[PDB]
Write a protein that binds this ligand. Sequence first.
Ligand SMILES: CS(=O)(=O)NCc1cccc(-c2cn3c(Cl)cnc3c(Nc3ccc(N4CCOCC4)cc3)n2)c1
Length: 253
Amino acid sequence: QWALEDFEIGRPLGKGKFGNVYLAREKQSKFILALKVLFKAQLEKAGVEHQLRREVEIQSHLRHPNILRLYGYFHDATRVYLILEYAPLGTVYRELQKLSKFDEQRTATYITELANALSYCHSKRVIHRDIKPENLLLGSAGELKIADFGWSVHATLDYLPPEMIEGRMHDEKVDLWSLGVLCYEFLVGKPPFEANTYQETYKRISRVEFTFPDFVTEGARDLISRLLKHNPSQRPMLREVLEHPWITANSSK
Ligand SMILES: CS(=O)(=O)NCc1cccc(-c2cn3c(Cl)cnc3c(Nc3ccc(N4CCOCC4)cc3)n2)c1
C-alpha cells in the first residue's frame, strides 16, 4: 500500500524512544496526520519487535473517540512508519507543564474520558499498562485521546502498580491504579510517588506511601484513595469510577 514518497513531511511534533513523530500530509488526499518514524536498528537492539507487532495489531483494531486511531503502516530499509491520527492540541503532559495544576472540572473530565476509553479497552480484553501524561493527546476540541499503546498487551516507575513493579502477575486492574496516579497528578501537579531515585519511588509505590496537600478536596481524596489500593481486587471497576459523586459532580462529559 503506502510508501514514504506518499507524504509531505512537516514539523517535528516531538521525540520518542526509537524515533520521532512528524506532522505530515498525504499528497493525493491533502489529509493531515502524524507520522511515527521508528528505526529497525534500535528496536532490534532492544528486542521490542514483538511489542510493536502488538501495538500495531491492537491500536489498528480499536475504534473509540478517546483512543488515537492508527490508520495503517509501512517500512523501507532503515525504518518502520506508523501512520497516525493527528491530535492538534498536544499532550496532557505539556498542558500540565503550562498550567501547573488542573482544576477539579478539567481533571474530572479527563478522568471520565479516560475511564470510558479504558472501559472499552477492557471489554475487548486489552490492558494498556503504560498510562501517563506523555501518552495522552488532545483532539481539536480538547478531548483526551489515549495514544501510544507501547507496552499494551492482549493479556519510569511513577505510574506502575505494586503488582507490576514487584514482578507479579497483573490484570485489567493495573489501569485503575494508573488512573488513580493520574487523578492525583492532575490535581497536585506531580505524581503521588515521585522521588529523586528509582529506588526510593519503588519503595514508595510498594508501601502505597503518599500524602495529600491541603487544597485537595474530600471528594478527590476518596476517589484517589480507592484507586490507589495495594490489592488489585480492592480497586473499583471502571463503572464505579464513572459513578463517583466527585466525578459526576465535576465532569462535563
Ligand atoms: C511539548 S510537546 O507537546 O511537544 N510534547 C512532545 C511530544 C512527545 C512525543 C510525542 C508527541 C506527539 C504525538 N502525536 C501523535 Cl502520535 C498525533 N499528534 C501528536 C502530537 N501533537 C502536537 C500538536 C500541537 C503541539 N504544539 C506545540 C506547542 O503548543 C502549540 C502546538 C505539539 C504536539 N504530539 C509530542
